[PDB]
Design a protein around this nucleic acid. Structure first.
Ligand SMILES: [K+]
Ligand SMILES: [K+]
Ligand SMILES: [Mg+2]
Ligand SMILES: [Mg+2]
Ligand SMILES: [Mg+2]
Ligand SMILES: [Mg+2]
Ligand SMILES: [Mg+2]
Length: 233
RNA sequence: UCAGCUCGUGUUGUGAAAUGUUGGGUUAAGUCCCGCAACGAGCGCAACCCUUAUCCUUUGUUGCCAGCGGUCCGGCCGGGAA
């Protein structure tokens, strides 16, 4: 695709963790070690990323919903920006256990967030007796921080794209439970067993994270434009 | 009158069960915040009730007497609404 080994090398995709923290299941994707730090095999990274991008493009063309999951402090704002410029949904703060498997309950929180936003736009807060308004705006802030990116999702997504599979093991487990395909960036210290589409690469570097997110956003934009509530655009 | 006791859905365990409800703080309080495979909800806590402590408005008799006028010195009388 558009991404090539050279720009991943520039970003730092090939850097992993220290050898003592590795998961032995990452041995096929590990190229070697330098200064007691693993080096991911970009020669394997590139085609796997291309295949994941193609599958994401197909999912977007079929009018599917893409959930971008990443809550690390180095990928939160990047994930939010990618999802916003891609018109898909995101979770960039702490994943609530049961967001997908207990969606019938998380829906009520989504509705409460919508109602609080409507009240804020109305102006019932200054009608309220000050302390109640402060409590309600604090609740609005908390609900926006938690479920801001899935407010308009309206149901289970058709695909998850995850940064730091190990950090988001709960989301990946829920997606495996529900049958939702998982594309994920898997570092050398992570277990790739639950991931349908593994992309070995650095998940701690802001440059690499932005590279992955930009490629995914671009490919899903093309996939969406392929249908766009029409025949072919 | 102790701050406790539970449920739904989700998740863990072959199972009895567990989690939530534990943890760091804080409170009279499972009180509240932060964290967190939990997300929410109910009965309890608190508040809504009565009374007491301050002020304002209205009303002023059988209750009151500051300014007045008398007076048998008793708000006693005419009055006054302070
Ligand atoms: K056991
Ligand atoms: K339960
Ligand atoms: Mg990493
Ligand atoms: Mg208990
Ligand atoms: Mg218990
Ligand atoms: Mg309580
Ligand atoms: Mg808790």
């Amino acid at each position: 695709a558009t991404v090539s080994m050279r720009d991943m090398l520039k970003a730092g995709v090939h850097f992993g963790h220290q050898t003592r923290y590795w998961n032995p299941k990452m041995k096929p994707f590990i190229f070697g070690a330098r200064n007691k730090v693993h080096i991911i095999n970009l020669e394997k990274t590139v085609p796997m990323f291309n295949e994941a991008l193609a599958e994401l493009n197909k999912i977007a063309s079929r009018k599917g919903k893409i959930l971008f999951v990443g809550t690390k402090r180095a990928a939160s704002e990047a994930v939010k920006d990618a999802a916003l410029s891609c018109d898909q949904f995101f979770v960039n703060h702490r994943w609530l256990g049961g967001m997908l498997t207990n969606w019938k309950t998380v829906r009520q929180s989504i509705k409460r967030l919508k109602d609080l936003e409507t009240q804020s736009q109305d102006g019932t807060f200054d009608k309220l007796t000050k302390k109640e308004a402060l409590m309600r705006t604090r609740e609005l802030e908390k609900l926006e921080n938690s479920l801001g990116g899935i407010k308009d999702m309206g149901g289970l997504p058709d695909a998850l794209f995850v940064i730091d599979a190990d950090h988001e093991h709960i989301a990946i487990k829920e997606a495996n439970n529900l049958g939702i395909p998982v594309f994920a960036i898997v570092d050398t210290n992570s277990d790739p067993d639950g991931v349908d589409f593994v992309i070995p690469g650095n998940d701690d570097a802001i440059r690499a994270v932005t590279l992955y997110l930009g490629a995914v956003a671009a490919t899903v934009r093309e996939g969406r434009s392929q249908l766009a509530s029409q025949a072919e655009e």
